[PDB]
Ligand binder design. Structure first.
Ligand SMILES: CCCCCCCCCCCCCCCCCC(=O)OC[C@H](COP(=O)([O-])OCC(O)COP(=O)([O-])OC[C@@H](COC(=O)CCCCCCCCCCCCCCCCC)OC(=O)CCCCCCCCCCCCCCCCC)OC(=O)CCCCCCCCCCCCCCCCC
Ligand code: BCL
Ligand code: BCL
Ligand SMILES: CC[C@H]1c2cc3[nH]c4c(c3C)C(=O)[C@H](C(=O)OC)c4c3nc(cc4[nH]c(cc(n2)[C@@H]1C)c(C(C)=O)c4C)[C@@H](C)[C@@H]3CCC(=O)OC/C=C(\C)CCC[C@H](C)CCC[C@H](C)CCCC(C)C
Ligand SMILES: CCCCCCCCCCCCCCCCCCCC(=O)O[C@H](COC(=O)CCCCCCCCCCCCCC)COP(=O)(O)OCCN
Ligand SMILES: COC(C)(C)C/C=C/C(C)=C/C=C/C(C)=C/C=C/C(C)=C/C=C/C=C(C)/C=C/C=C(\C)CC/C=C(\C)CCC=C(C)C
Ligand SMILES: COC(C)(C)C/C=C/C(C)=C/C=C/C(C)=C/C=C/C(C)=C/C=C/C=C(C)/C=C/C=C(\C)CC/C=C(\C)CCC=C(C)C
Ligand SMILES: COC(C)(C)C/C=C/C(C)=C/C=C/C(C)=C/C=C/C(C)=C/C=C/C=C(C)/C=C/C=C(\C)CC/C=C(\C)CCC=C(C)C
Ligand SMILES: COC(C)(C)C/C=C/C(C)=C/C=C/C(C)=C/C=C/C(C)=C/C=C/C=C(C)/C=C/C=C(\C)CC/C=C(\C)CCC=C(C)C
Ligand SMILES: COC(C)(C)C/C=C/C(C)=C/C=C/C(C)=C/C=C/C(C)=C/C=C\C=C(C)\C=C\C=C(/C)CC/C=C(\C)CCC=C(C)C
Ligand SMILES: CCCCCCCCCCCCO[C@@H]1O[C@H](CO)[C@@H](O[C@H]2O[C@H](CO)[C@@H](O)[C@H](O)[C@H]2O)[C@H](O)[C@H]1O
Ligand SMILES: CCCCCCCCCCCCO[C@@H]1O[C@H](CO)[C@@H](O[C@H]2O[C@H](CO)[C@@H](O)[C@H](O)[C@H]2O)[C@H](O)[C@H]1O
Ligand SMILES: [Fe+3]
Lengths: 306, 281, 43, 13, 54, 248, 54, 54, 42, 43, 54, 53, 42, 43, 51
């Protein structure tokens, strides 16, 4: 019966906001796109403008090549049949070369070479996007927290696709490009290394993924509960603490016995999120290269009855 | 004992039940009626877990496990050494979580803020109840519920999932995972963006939310906004947990086969069910 | 015309050396293709 | 949208 | 090509040059990888077989 | 395949897990100390420094530079509630509520509390007023939902308290912030959008009764609002939830 | 034939050129790959079998 | 019959032109792919048969 | 009209759109005839 | 009219140079197709 | 009967045209796919059987 | 009668869109059911009559 | 008026809607009749 | 009646041209159906 | 009895009641079709020897 502030009840539109021109080449920035009332019911209605620099276009074209390579392989697997393509869309897979090729690049296209091509494209796209996040932060004079938070996820991705295959000595260890295919790869990876549940770093990574869900629920709910005091304007609460920040702090102080500040809760948030992929990459790197049976390792380290 | 701004908020009122009997603070904690309930439930459960550790014969915290009763006990009680301790710890935990949420409601009322936090925690409690109460009740045994051990509820997850093949193919499981991954991504982005605005490069003026919107419009062409991001985080977490509970409530009660077979309905649509080639055909 | 705000003399002095670089690149590429075809023809 | 929310295409269009 | 100078009247030179560099680099790598994939043209493999290496 | 253990069962996985325990302890210490830049040192209920300050020491000060020449904020710094809190304790010992001495909603305590913020308007990235009335907001209009201009405003006591005459908008975020309500006395008040319930025929305000819209603090300038003023208004309206309960 | 210049009056030249370049490169790559997949036109395999390179 | 031009007073010419270009290219590729997938009309396989290339 | 284009603008736009369309359809029917004499589908 | 902010003279010149490029591209395409067909016909 | 035009007052003509076109194309694709599905009317397989192309 | 009062409450536009979706779904379902029964698949029946398969 | 439509507006809109319904139903009846002539299902 | 701001004359001419288009589309469809039924009737 | 329209909003009740009516009716029709004693099309096909 009361307004929960989940959806805006009255939308307001003014002149298009071009943004802050700190050091941004206004040539690279595109024009403001359309206004989406559907998106405006939940957040901002404005689309664009989007910046397109050197790294932006490099990453966009490299990612387009990766996506197109996978899609053309999928069309080949369908026998160029659109009905088959739609029927088996989730069952298609661009697989890495068989283990007998090792890390060599001399695998046939149908048996792993096209996977290497798509992998190179993806590698370029992701690293150019990382540089792009760093440079976009730099142009506006902001800190580089987004770049390092992205670097954590990039490290999990690199361990999965690049570093662990090299350590294990074959491209066959890497992840195929496919919807159900990479799910099968995940399940098989767990089975081969003996119940990845007993990997300590898989356990910590899950602790932090659960903790990210918990913490974003807590933080979103807290900010919505104090939005009646302008609590969603967190930067001004950092600069000039209002009653929203105090009420949020006191809620969690009286509930848990300790609280955060408007600025430090975001340190909690960023670390809780990055630890997911950081710990996960460590665990995946250890799997196979150091421990090949995590249940037996568990038994030898407590964690499981002998 | 108090924060520098805390005193002007410690006024009486907002209590759901009581009003003076349990309207005070112990240290930083607000002690309501539900405060007393939560403390007793938590202490009873923890010391019962310690007692079960004594019974089991291990002092390894990782090895401590409180299994529910075996399947032949049905939905009935069991000897404390066998399955009853789990049931007492389960009722204690349920009471502790519910009273914790109610204590949060009291704290919200005293502070004059919305009730979003207890609502989200209620989502979490409902998922827990699905795992311990609703699903085992629909399957007619407390033995289906997970044990209370650090590394033995993982064995419960493993066995329960592998009962249905690769559990990845549960579609509500896929949706819940998408929400979980999206939520972690959004949390990283939100923490990073706020910290980068509040901590500019070197001796630079603190940034405004206009800079945050500009950063994300430059990056991906959209900016959900300061209010929209908190709405999105809350909704992503709650939807993740909702679809988790939904995926487990239908497993073993509405679905009994391997989950991968559920996808056959797409590959067997009559227009393309019998076209050779591809993967399934 | 005039989207980037430049002069036709600048366009000339730019496009000429652009074609210079293109022709250098194409000449080296043609030499490489000739050497490969001699070494191991693909037709 | 919640007022017309009591398949989805009816509220969608 | 004496009328093709007008591209620089509509396209910023930096954008054109970076796009050209990106395209050429990606295309070159793709073609070299395709050649390495085909055992008929894997020059390392060809020389390995020619000189009795491993 | 590595897996040689240096001693006992201590392989590379054990090294990694213990290294992570050390790193996590250090990180938790860092996060907790960084979250002590406000509200510390702890105080007794009489405002004197407490004997117990906690296991975590206070961090080194850091200074934020405000974006429009608004100054510099160093935290943690001296803290003083620059307002006369009107409360009296109900017990000699600690950990008990402090009852209001007079009208809590009027005095600004409890759920009606406000914070002595800066008495300047919030400035966007261009140095202009962030929140301004739709009249002064050029090109700003209602895009969706029922436009609440001229809708009667009903209180928690279910009687009309006034009519909305304008919408105050956050310019960069392009979202509604406040409804300006003209009461039966010809004077204007601001109401946060988060505490109004726009409906088909009326704007409902569950927080306040009809005989409370007069008590809402006003803005000295009719075309702008400062952080202090909106803090007072929002605190008043929110405290109406607890302190207008006797009416409804 | 000649009155088609008006399309440049209704469309931004720069975006059209970018889209055209992307479209043509994707089409060329797709066709070359289709020919590679078909053994009848896999010129690398054809040359290999013709010259006994495998 | 000769009064259809008023359709241009309903929709932006750019939107309809981009939508119809996308639709036409997608339809052309769809039909070409349907022809390739049917072995009786796969012109590549048909030429391979008619010229004994396999 | 919604776009705001006047009568003459719509006339010119439609007359050139049809001018393109007829060329497209003529090339299409030439291609169809070539295929049909090559390999009829009826 | 003038959605792109261009003039009929500028649009005419732009279309002329674009069509010149298109015809060169189509000419090279024709040559390549002829070479392929004489190398391997596909009908 | 002759007063149907007033529906254009209630409904937005642009959205009506777009949604109607999408429905028409989906319907036609669905019917052509029914015809392709049935061996009695799959004109490609019919022509192949008539001219003995398999 | 007095049925036109039904337009005084429900939005005409969403009523018409819902009616169109409902009618299309029902017609498609009825035709598909007729196809499913081999005795009413008019393509199959015509094939049997004209000795087509 | 509960949603803004008048008495005459509601009457005319319902008349058009019912006229369309009757046209659709007459066409459907002719379809069922021709089908029953072809092969009765009873 | 509203909901768009249109008029009687604009809506009427829109519907007239739309109905002409529907009649032409139906004529082409019926010609196609007749040709198909002659080629291979389904009745 | 007459007060049901006062507590409950007409739109929700009307739409839900109609939706339930349609789904229950089509379920009944499906159940009748499924069993070989109320599948009218099969009865007609066997009757006219068109099966
Ligand atoms: C590693 C490569 C370095 C990456 C980070 C570089 C950096 O310093 O960023 C500053 C970065 C941006 O600074 P800025 O924008 O230049 O500064 C603006 C202003 O000056 C204002 O800047 P600011 O003051 O906001 O930033 C200060 C921030 C910056 O500090 C950091 O970034 C530290 C990064 C720590 C990386 C930890 C690696 C994981 C180790 C796990 C154990 C292995 C087993 O300080 C902290 O966050 C301290 C965190 C706690 C550190 C100490 C923890 C206890 C140590 C345990 C021993 C003692 C007990 O600050 C942040 O964004 C911090 C949050 C994000 C951290 C992301 C960490 C990513 C890790 C790399 C990805 C994975 C790579 C492979 C790892 C796996 C190998 C096994
Ligand atoms: C049967 C399967 C096994 C299992 C096998 C594995 C394997 C194998 C792995 C995990 C991993 C994880 N497991 Mg596990 N896991 C199991 C059971 C679980 C259960 C459960 C309740 O049962 C949970 C909650 C989890 C949860 C987790 C996560 C904590 C962790 C994934 C972190 C992540 O976010 O990666 C997702 C994020 C990334 C992969 C990085 C993405 C960053 C890149 C750069 C993205 C680029 C986008 C790309 C370019 C495309 C662009 C798109 C367009 C731009 C839109 N697992 C069981 C035991 N699990 C991962 C891990 O961390 O190991 C410890 C992992 O490798
Ligand atoms: C051998 C047996 C007979 C047969 C035995 C029966 C029996 C017995 C019955 C039917 C009935 C029906 N049969 Mg029969 N029927 C047979 C096979 C068929 C076949 C077929 C494919 O062969 C078809 C198409 C039908 C068709 C029908 C329907 C016309 C009718 C059900 C109407 C209905 O449920 O409306 C339900 C939908 C509504 C009422 C509209 C409401 C839903 C809307 C969309 C949602 C609400 C929105 C709205 C705006 C809300 C505001 C207003 C609200 C309505 C309050 N039958 C065979 C041939 N049939 C039933 C009947 O006669 O009922 C009249 C019935 O009892
Ligand atoms: C719904 C979205 C996510 C969410 C939200 C959420 N959680 C919340 C909240 C919210 C909004 C709170 O306000 C509340 C809180 O106070 O947070 C600090 C909380 C909370 N979520 C917590 C944990 C938690 N949340 C989890 C999940 C989630 N929380 C969701 C993913 C998980 C997971 C996935 O594992 C955990 C572990 C607590 C820190 C806290 C609730 C504290 C509480 O209930 O206090 C009273 C109870 C005790 C002090 C302990 C009682 C102990 C029992 C008596 C005995 C043990 C029983 C138990 C079953 C044993 C388990 C054994 C093994 C399975 C390990
Ligand atoms: C990113 C990584 C996130 C990891 C999250 C999971 C791991 C647990 C993290 C616990 C952080 C605790 C931080 C300190 C909190 C604390 O001790 O506060 C005291 C109450 O303690 C308590 O209530 C103890 C905390 C609850 C039990 C934890 C086990 C009150 O004192 P204070 O810390 O406010 O004092 C500060 C100096 N005055
Ligand atoms: C899967 O399919 C495969 C890959 C097998 C086959 C497919 C192949 C395909 C699709 C190939 C496509 C090839 C294309 C489109 C090639 C196009 C190549 C072009 C246009 C290359 C242009 C090159 C230009 C170059 C290299 C210019 C270089 C210039 C310099 C090095 C110096 C330039 C500096 C200048 C001009 C200074 C100018 C600045 C001022 C201010 C005057
Ligand atoms: C499984 O079920 C199967 C498929 C077996 C059987 C089921 C069959 C079913 C459900 C069939 C349903 C068929 C239906 C509903 C067919 C309806 C078709 C209709 C209504 C087609 C209408 C077409 C109308 C057209 C193409 C109109 C075109 C109009 C124009 C091109 C005019 C352009 C507009 C202008 C010029 C605007 C004028 C503006 C001013 C200012 C005058
Ligand atoms: C699965 O199906 C397969 C793929 C097997 C078969 C399907 C095939 C299909 C559907 C093929 C579709 C092919 C199409 C539609 C091809 C269209 C190709 C076109 C339109 C190519 C046009 C190229 C135009 C070019 C190359 C023009 C270049 C012009 C320039 C570079 C001139 C530079 C412009 C300037 C200087 C303008 C500046 C002027 C001023 C006044 C500043
Ligand atoms: C397995 O067994 C099964 C399920 C198949 C048997 C069960 C069958 C069942 C349950 C069947 C249920 C059938 C029902 C409920 C059928 C209802 C059909 C209806 C409501 C049809 C109504 C159609 C209305 C039409 C066609 C009206 C068209 C009107 C126009 C085209 C005029 C357009 C004017 C408008 C929209 C507004 C006028 C306003 C102005 C200003 C002009
Ligand atoms: C109609 O459809 C069209 C054709 C138009 C477009 C359709 C496209 C489609 C259907 C795309 C489908 C895409 C899918 C299913 C993508 C799935 C991707 C997934 C699930 C990826 C999952 C994991 C990938 C990982 C972990 C990749 C890791 C890769 C790296 C870490 C870099 C790898 C780099 C390597 C191995 C070295 C490369 C370097 C050289 C020199 C080869
Ligand atoms: C970014 C990391 C770069 C450094 C990578 C270092 C590893 C270099 C390649 C891995 C070494 C390959 O080692 C070779 O593997 C082949 C199988 O393919 C095997 O051949 C037998 C042997 O194991 C070894 O001769
Ligand atoms: C929690 C953070 C603080 C950790 C302690 C601080 C020091 C950090 C480095 C510690 C590294 C050594 O840590 C120590 O390694 C040895 C290696 O066998 C472990 O192993 C020892 O105990 C286990 C369990 O009873 C036996 O199975 C094993 O045979 C025995 O050697 C110890 O259980 C562990 O305590
Ligand atoms: Fe936040």
């Amino acid at each position: 019966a009361e307004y929960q502030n989940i959806f805006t009840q009255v939308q307001v539109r003014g002149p298009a906001d071009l943004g802050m021109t700190e050091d941004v080449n206004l040539a690279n920035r595109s024009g403001v796109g359309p206004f989406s009332t559907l998106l405006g019911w939940f957040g901002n209605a404005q689309l664009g403008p989007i910046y397109l620099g050197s790294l932006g276009v490099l990453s966009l074209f490299s990612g387009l090549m990766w996506f197109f390579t996978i899609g053309i392989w999928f069309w080949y697997q369908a026998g160029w049949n659109p009905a088959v393509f739609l029927r088996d869309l989730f069952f298609f897979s661009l697989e890495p070369p068989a283990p007998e090729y090792g890390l060599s690049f001399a695998a046939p296209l149908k048996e792993g070479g096209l996977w290497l091509i798509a992998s190179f494209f993806m590698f370029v796209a992701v690293w150019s996007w990382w540089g792009r996040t760093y440079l976009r932060a730099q142009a506006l004079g902001m800190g580089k927290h987004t770049a390092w938070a992205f670097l954590s996820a990039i490290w999990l991705w690199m361990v999965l696709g690049f570093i662990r295959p090299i350590l294990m000595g074959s491209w066959s260890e890497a992840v195929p490009y496919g919807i159900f295919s990479h799910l099968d790869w995940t399940n098989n990876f767990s089975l081969v290394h003996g119940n990845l549940f007993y990997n300590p770093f898989h356990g910590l990574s899950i602790a932090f993924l659960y903790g990210s869900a918990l913490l974003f629920a807590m933080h979103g709910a807290t900010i919505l509960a104090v939005s009646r005091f302008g609590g969603e304007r967190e930067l001004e609460q950092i600069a000039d603490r209002g009653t929203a920040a105090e009420r949020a702090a006191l809620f969690w102080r009286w509930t848990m016995g300790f609280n955060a500040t408007m600025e430090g809760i975001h340190r909690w948030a960023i670390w809780m999120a990055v630890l997911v992929t950081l710990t996960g990459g460590i665990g995946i790197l250890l799997s196979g290269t150091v421990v090949d049976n995590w249940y037996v390792w568990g038994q030898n380290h407590g964690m499981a009855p002998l | 004992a108090l924060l520098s701004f805390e005193r002007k908020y410690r006024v009486p009122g907002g209590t759901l039940v009581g009003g003076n009997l349990f309207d005070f603070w112990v240290g930083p904690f607000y002690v309501g009626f539900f405060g007393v309930a939560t403390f007793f439930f938590a202490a009873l459960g923890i010391i019962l877990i310690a007692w079960s550790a004594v019974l089991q014969g291990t002092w390894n915290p990782q090895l401590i496990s409180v299994y529910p009763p075996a399947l032949e006990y049905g939905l009935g009680g069991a000897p404390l050494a066998k399955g009853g301790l789990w049931q007492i710890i389960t009722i204690c935990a349920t009471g502790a979580f519910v009273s914790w949420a109610l204590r949060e409601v009291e704290i919200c009322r005293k502070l004059g803020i919305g009730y979003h936090i207890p609502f989200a925690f209620a989502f979490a409690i409902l998922a827990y109840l699905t795992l311990v109460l609703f699903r085992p009740v629909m399957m007619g045994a407390w033995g289906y519920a997970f044990p209370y051990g650090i590394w033995t509820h993982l064995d419960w997850v493993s066995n329960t999932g592998y009962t249905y093949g690769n559990f990845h193919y549960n579609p509500a499981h896929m949706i819940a995972i998408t929400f979980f991954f999206t939520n972690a991504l959004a949390l990283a982005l939100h923490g990073a963006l706020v910290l980068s605005a509040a901590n500019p490069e070197k001796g630079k003026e603190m940034r405004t939310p206009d800079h945050e919107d500009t950063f994300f419009r430059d990056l991906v062409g959209y900016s959900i906004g300061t209010l929209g991001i908190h709405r999105l985080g809350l909704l992503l977490s709650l939807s993740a947990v909702f679809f988790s509970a939904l995926c487990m409530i239908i497993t073993g009660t509405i679905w009994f086969d391997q989950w991968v077979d559920w996808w056959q309905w797409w590959v067997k649509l009559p227009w393309w069910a019998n076209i050779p080639g591809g993967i399934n055909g | 015309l005039g989207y980037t705000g430049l002069t036709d003399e600048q366009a000339q002095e730019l496009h000429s050396v652009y074609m210079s670089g293109l022709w250098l690149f194409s000449a080296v590429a043609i030499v490489a293709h000739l050497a490969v075809y001699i070494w191991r023809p693909w037709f | 949208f919640a007022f017309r929310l009591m398949a989805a295409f009816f509220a969608a269009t | 090509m004496s009328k093709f100078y007008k591209i620089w009247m509509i396209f910023d030179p930096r954008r054109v040059f970076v796009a050209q560099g990106v395209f050429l680099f990606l295309l070159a790598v793709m073609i070299h990888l395709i050649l390495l994939s085909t055992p008929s043209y894997n020059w390392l493999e060809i020389s390995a077989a020619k000189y009795n290496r491993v | 395949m590595v897996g040689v253990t240096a001693f006992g069962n201590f392989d590379l996985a054990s090294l990694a897990i213990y290294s992570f325990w050390i790193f996590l302890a250090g990180l938790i210490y860092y996060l907790q100390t960084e979250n002590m830049r406000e509200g510390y040192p702890l105080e007794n209920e009489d405002g004197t420094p407490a004997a117990n300050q906690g296991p975590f020491p206070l961090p080194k000060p850091k200074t934020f530079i405000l974006p429009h020449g608004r100054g510099t904020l160093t935290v943690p710094g001296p803290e003083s509630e620059d307002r006369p809190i009107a409360l009296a304790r109900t017990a000699v010992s600690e950990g008990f509520p402090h009852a209001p001495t007079g009208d809590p909603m009027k005095d600004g305590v409890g759920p009606a509390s406000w914070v002595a913020r800066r008495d300047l308007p919030e400035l966007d990235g261009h140095g202009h007023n962030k929140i301004k009335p739709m009249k002064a907001a050029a090109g700003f209009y209602v895009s969706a939902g029922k436009n609440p201009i001229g809708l009667p405003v009903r209180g928690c006591d279910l009687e009309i308290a006034g009519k909305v005459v304008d919408i105050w908008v956050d310019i960069p975020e392009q979202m509604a912030r406040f409804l300006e309500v003209e009461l039966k006395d010809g004077s204007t008040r601001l109401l946060p959008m988060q505490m109004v319930k726009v409906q088909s025929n009326r704007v409902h305000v569950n927080a306040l009764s009809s005989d409370l819209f007069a008590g809402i603090p006003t803005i000295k300038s009719p075309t702008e609002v400062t952080l202090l003023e909106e803090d007072k208004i929002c605190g008043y309206v929110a405290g109406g939830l607890m302190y207008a309960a006797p009416k409804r």
